From a paper:
Tripartite systems of the Resistance Nodulation cell Division (RND) superfamily are composed of an inner-membrane RND transporter driven by the proton motive force, an outer-membrane factor (OMF), and a periplasmic membrane fusion protein (MFP), forming a tripartite pump with a contiguous exit duct. Among the major RND actors in drug resistance in Pseudomonas aeruginosa, MexB transporter works in conjunction with OprM (OMF component), and MexA (MFP component). Archetypical RND transporters operate as a secondary proton/drug antiporter exploiting the energy associated to proton transport in their transmembrane domains to power the export of substrates through the periplasmic pore domain, 60 Å away, via long-range conformational communication. Crystal structure determination revealed that MexB as well as the E coli homologous AcrB are asymmetric homotrimers for which the three monomer conformations representing consecutive states were designated Loose (or Access), Tight (or Binding), and Open (or Extrusion).
Firstly, the 3.2 Å resolution tripartite complex structure in nanodisc revealed a 1:2:1 stoichiometry of OprM, MexA, and MexB with a OprM trimer, a MexB trimer (MexB-trio) and a MexA hexamer surrounding MexB and interacting with OprM in an open conformation. MexB-trio adopted an asymmetric LTO conformation for all the particles contributing to the cryo-EM 3D reconstruction. In the tripartite complex, six MexA protomers formed a symmetric dome on top of MexB with their lipoyl and hairpin domains, and used their β-barrel and MP domains for interacting with MexB subdomains. This MexA hexameric dome resulted from the arrangement of two non-equivalent MexA molecules (MexA-I and MexA-II) bound per MexB protomer. For MexA-I, the β-barrel and MP domains interacted respectively with the β-hairpin loop (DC) and the turn of the long β−loop (DN) crossing each monomer of MexB respectively without major overall structural modifications. Unlike MexA-I, the MexA-II contacts were at the vicinity of the conformational changes observed on MexB-trio. In addition to these stabilizing contacts, MexA-II MP was in interaction with PN2 domain of the protomer T which exhibited a conformational change regarding protomer T of MexB-solo. The constraint on the PN2 domain of MexB protomer T at residue Q319 imposed by MexA-II MP created the contact surface which is unique compared with those between MexA-II MP and protomers L and O. In contrast to the OprM-MexA interface, the MP and β-barrel domains of MexA formed a loose interface, with a reduced energy binding, resulting in a cap on top of the MexB trimer that would allow its required alternative movements.
Author numbering:
A (entry chain A), B (entry chain C), C (entry chain B): 1 to 455
């Protein structure tokens, strides 16, 4: 009998197109290939982090945990799949009991004996009303939720390892520029020390140069700490150590990530795995509704066995000592004064709760992909302003170098312009890292790189 | 009879008065109307914010989830309410079985038959010592805890929506001020371009103005990203988007909130819902003590059913085929190695755990309201210092404007003072937003607006 | 016997030597006294902080929660320990039933009667293949896991108390130096007001001095907020009020901590308690395997009771009414579609999930210890840079004071020299506090002071 109600997908309350604004460009609309289709071998153009992701494909702990949990829920589904079949079980008994006089078969306290072994099925409940089929659907939906959870864990691990590698790649060049700053400040301090030893400058200019030398040295120590912490973070996110057979990495400013079209929100609930996980939870709640609905109807039970029984032990396996049994049973409670109706109410409440959580997850996913669209719309113009600033600092440094090589001004006002140059370009490298991290997070939230290659 | 232990509320280890110091303002004594009495329609002075809170009352997911969970705990309380009543039902039974020759009463392999359809009570659980009453009280306490969870969720939602709207307004005002800064830098760069094209200024003075206008352009892009993302963070918490027919949003420095007396910490013992969660969990643990202690006592069961039974089928519904049953049983385990004793002291330990977390919730609430009192005592003076800074910069700009229009200075050293004016002025909107956020989550931490109107 | 598979320790995937770099110092190899060896009392050299850890030893809430959960899992272990023994119980029985004529013993609607008081064992399983022993040491391993959770909570509490106390001292020193800043700014504003009232200085210098005075007055309120909020956090971590009988505190520049050797990656395999909790979860999953392995084997059941039965109520306690029963039973289900196989491989999969989580915990602990080693390798040079920066500003201030007292420059340049002096001085307390916080977190993650002294 059919008792699970018809499943229906709840409506997405968000707008069917992405909202616009001054930070956003033009919505390209729906496209042929969204971010769930492009694998991670095609998105990241650097081969080194690709080989790192290929290492983390098998050497990570949480991916192994989720891959085992998939098989766990598969075995839990197969347990209930086996429970639909009748359970054959060897049951061996034995009886030696005394009785009182008024209750005996003799009218006297005789010690009666009995022995019997049997095999067959006991309490074979027939799924006429779809209770065990509902539990089968519930175990199947939980297994599907587990594999969607493995997809989500793999995509988040890919994004985390990618951001850690790009952060290390940024901070290496930033440490190089801070070493350049320390060298510039050491040259400036040596020049002012020479000028103080000759007698032109006072002690105060020497102190005020040393106070900025110490500031550059402290910034160098901070950036070395950041480099080391990004290294040991990438080591943890990889599981194994950093390999030496890696290919040459590519620099940040040339494009390492391909562009993905924005698509539409609706295909995102077709493609993002946690929305499918909430959908599987909703279908599991509907299966529990079907189970609680099948709890109202009567229960059919069957017990059928065959074996040999006797009074003594050696006379059990004799010829003619066989015995068969057939008993059907029907159970139906009547006075359910708020037990089964409250259970059905509990199940309907669980379905409505999973509906609300499904719409909540839809709205959350829409919020983060809209934030990614905003970061995409703004970081290009931010790095354009940064690159123009670095260009202006470079022209300033070239003019100061021409002025120095003519002989008009000294090495001090060449050195400070040299300092301004790379303290501008390290603040280009910072926010180059931020556009790279924002694009990785936008690729992850739009469906992620569950597959390796493009479908 | 009932052997549930008596309930006593533990003593809070906090100070009876609010702590004092230097930045602490003077306490206004006992609060006649605290924050839990004050509704959200009276606290926020903006009609636009109250309209969107009225939207978020009905069109959010987790606020619906909490109410559905309240209905769920009501249903599971009704289950253990119905548990006290006996469960009668119909039981149909068929029997066709062979017997061995030595064990039969006739001495033959008899294929005997039996049929019957009985009606009545089987295994009637009798609550003689309040075990089922203790489970009913545990279900009721969990229902009250789920009831308080909806108030906690509504207060956190009201605070989050209020702070999100305030951050949106503050970001819009700061975006307008960065637009003015970009206009000022554009005018100054055009004037330096004119001076360089004439021949009075060198290229270096052009390059530094270019760096200034590029840095301001990057800051404008960053603040436009902030404005674009805070609308997303608001629309996510609202569920729906921003409506078109909205009331006029009042100003940030204009009064948007009302004063709330902090009163006493003991009033928070009546008013913050998480302490009520810990209290309901404590009483549920006491109900579990009652259950585990009533598990010691003997359990009485009853089986009484009547109906028709026969050897054959069509002779079931005959005259005189009726028969009744009466079987009272009493089960009592005696010798264990402290099994039920371990269940009993396990439940007592669960009570002591709930006492300890009941005290830690009081300590967390005390620390939160003390941080709110510190922010209240500091922000009113910090914003006054910022306002004095703003008016000093405004007097500076006015004197520079008079000095410009008399002809003494050029437009550049008017524009830089005009620039310093609103770059100091955005530091009023910043920390005005922080004072408003501190007052909002202090209002939430004191109990919040669970009701719409003040009682 | 026992079907439990024998346990052996999995492989630690990380490198067995601490990784080296430019910021990393020399590894001192393995050491006999790690962080878990010495107690917390001789580590923190402040007697006040030791007294606050001493009152945190008893007056905290989560420590009490952890000790009570330890006793809870002990009681749950004693439940399964008592489960080996037979449950001897008394079962009082009454029986009065009518029967149909074709099924009765007389051919008549006879009302048969029976009464009985019986005492003995029912359904007593005999642990032949080690299932109940597996559940017993499963609960025992969970109890040891809860003990390691208690140790982890205690070490986390000690680390949090130490960080809060040192942050209190740092914020107090920063508040004192910002008070000195407000004083010098007020003196500079008074001298500028005198110069404006005489007539030498225009109003613009007065405005731009007043803006600086307001900028320092904002920082004063911003730091006196943080002093009080950190006092609040300390009171929350302490669980009670701040004691008035405290010993004197020692400042941050004095030796507050002691040297702890980093040792080896293997030493944490013995000493950090969350790894011990993970391997206790390992042994719990292995005991789950050992409990699931007994389902394939036959199970023993026993039912044996003696007592007095009769047909009448008062005729129960009569001579000759004593009777006994002996009933053995053997159960073995045979036909399944992989039910018990999937349950067993499900338990094995849970064990493999546990080995993967056990490796992940070791990897995260190694990452945290690498962060602590990098902070130790860098904050010494950062503090040296801040210290000789302070010394340079002090020599600057002394030369400016000599130049003032000979009469060359005014009080104004002396005041703005003292301004930068204690600015660079308050920039030492930040990154002194960060070094001490990093060393406290390193001592926590390396094993912590679970004991009070060294043993």
């Amino acid at each position: 009998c059919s008792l699970i109600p018809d499943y229906q997908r709840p409506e997405a309350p968000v707008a069917a197109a992405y909202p616009q604004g001054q930070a956003y460009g033009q919505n390209t609309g729906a496209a042929a290939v969204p971010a769930a289709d492009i694998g991670w071998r095609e998105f990241f153009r650097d081969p080194q982090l690709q080989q790192l992701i290929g290492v983390a494909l098998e050497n990570n702990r949480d991916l192994r945990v989720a891959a085992l949990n998939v098989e766990a829920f598969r075995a839990q589904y197969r347990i209930q799949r086996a429970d639909l079949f009748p359970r054959i079980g060897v049951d061996g008994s034995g009886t030696r009991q005394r009785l009182p006089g008024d209750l005996s078969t003799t009218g006297s306290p005789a010690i009666s004996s009995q022995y019997g072994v049997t095999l067959g099925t006991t309490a074979w409940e027939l799924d006429l009303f779809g209770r065990l089929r509902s539990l089968r659907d519930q175990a199947l939906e939980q297994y599907l939720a587990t594999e969607q959870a493995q997809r989500s864990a793999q995509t988040t691990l890919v994004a985390s390892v990618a951001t850690a590698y790009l952060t290390l790649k940024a901070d290496q060049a930033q440490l190089q520029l801070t070493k350049d700053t320390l060298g510039t400040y050491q040259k400036s301090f040596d020049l002012t020390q020479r000028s103080y030893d000759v007698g032109v400058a006072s002690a105060l200019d020497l102190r005020q140069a040393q106070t900025a030398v110490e500031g550059a040295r402290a910034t160098l120590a901070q950036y070395t700490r950041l480099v080391a912490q990004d290294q040991n973070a990438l080591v943890l996110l990889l599981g194994s150590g950093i390999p030496a057979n890696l290919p040459q990495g590519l620099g940040l400013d040339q494009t390492l990530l391909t562009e993905v079209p924005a698509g539409l929100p609706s295909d995102l609930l077709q493609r993002r795995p946690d929305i499918l996980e909430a959908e599987h939870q909703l279908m599991a709640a509907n299966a529990s509704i079907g189970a609680a609905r099948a709890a109202f109807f009567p229960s059919i039970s069957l017990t059928a066995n065959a074996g040999t029984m006797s009074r003594q032990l050696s006379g059990l396996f004799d010829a003619g000592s066989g015995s068969w049994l057939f008993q059907p049973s029907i159970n139906l409670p009547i006075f359910t004064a708020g037990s089964l109706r409250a259970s059905l109410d509990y199940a309907k409440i669980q379905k409505d709760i999973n509906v609300a959580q499904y719409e909540k997850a839809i709205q959350t996913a829409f919020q983060e992909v809209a934030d990614g669209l905003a970061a995409r719309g703004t970081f290009t113009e931010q790095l354009q302003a940064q690159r123009d600033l670095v260009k202006a600092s470079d022209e300033y440094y070239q003019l100061a170098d021409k002025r120095y090589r003519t002989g008009v001004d000294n090495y001090l006002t060449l050195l400070d312009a040299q300092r301004s140059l790379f303290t501008a370009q390290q603040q280009l490298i910072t926010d180059r890292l931020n556009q790279l991290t924002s694009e990785v997070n936008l690729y992850k939230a739009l469906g992620g790189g569950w597959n390796q290659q493009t479908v």
